[PDB]
Write a protein that binds this ligand. Structure first.
Ligand SMILES: Nc1nc2c(ncn2[C@@H]2O[C@H](COP(=O)(O)O)[C@@H](O)[C@H]2O)c(=O)[nH]1
Length: 132
């Protein structure tokens, strides 16, 4: 979990389960589906949450990525496509990534997270499990 309240994603996360696998999408893909969001607004980034486990006397928590619309979240000020560790930029081919998405943040208990879903044809990154 988080010990500093996070910016809340509209969407469920995507969790790595196989080490060694890269988090990626084909250009033009990787924006999760939300009812009524026009394709011109489908732009943003996946943000990596590095997780850390406590030591036991048993025997390791892999990252989980969350989506933020362009101009929101923890990297709200960074330019689209800029090489930044833990940030993976995604956008519909219909989006102009020079402008922030006209999309209001989520929460409080106005709205639960939308289960992450992608349109038919989307190449899913192997080794990752989409929450929900
Ligand atoms: N605790 C926590 N919840 C978040 C965060 N980002 C937004 N959320 C919500 O937590 C859920 C993440 O999906 P889940 O990984 O639990 O399947 C999403 O519904 C997401 O919007 C976060 O950074 N920390």
């Amino acid at each position: 979990e988080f010990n500093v309240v996070p910016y809340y994603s509209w969407f469920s996360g995507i969790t790595q389960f196989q080490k060694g696998k890269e988090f990626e999408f084909v250009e033009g893909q990787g924006v999760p589906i939300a009812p009524g969001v026009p394709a011109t607004e489908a732009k943003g980034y996946w943000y990596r949450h590095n997780r850390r486990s406590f030591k036991t006397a048993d025997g390791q928590l892999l990252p989980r990525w969350y989506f933020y619309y362009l101009g929101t979240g923890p990297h709200a000020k960074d330019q689209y496509g800029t090489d930044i560790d833990g940030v993976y930029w995604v956008a519909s081919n219909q989006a102009d990534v020079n402008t922030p998405a006209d999309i209001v943040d989520r929460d409080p208990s106005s709205d639960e997270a939308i289960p992450t879903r992608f349109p038919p044809g989307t190449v899913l990154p192997q080794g990752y499990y989409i929450e929900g």
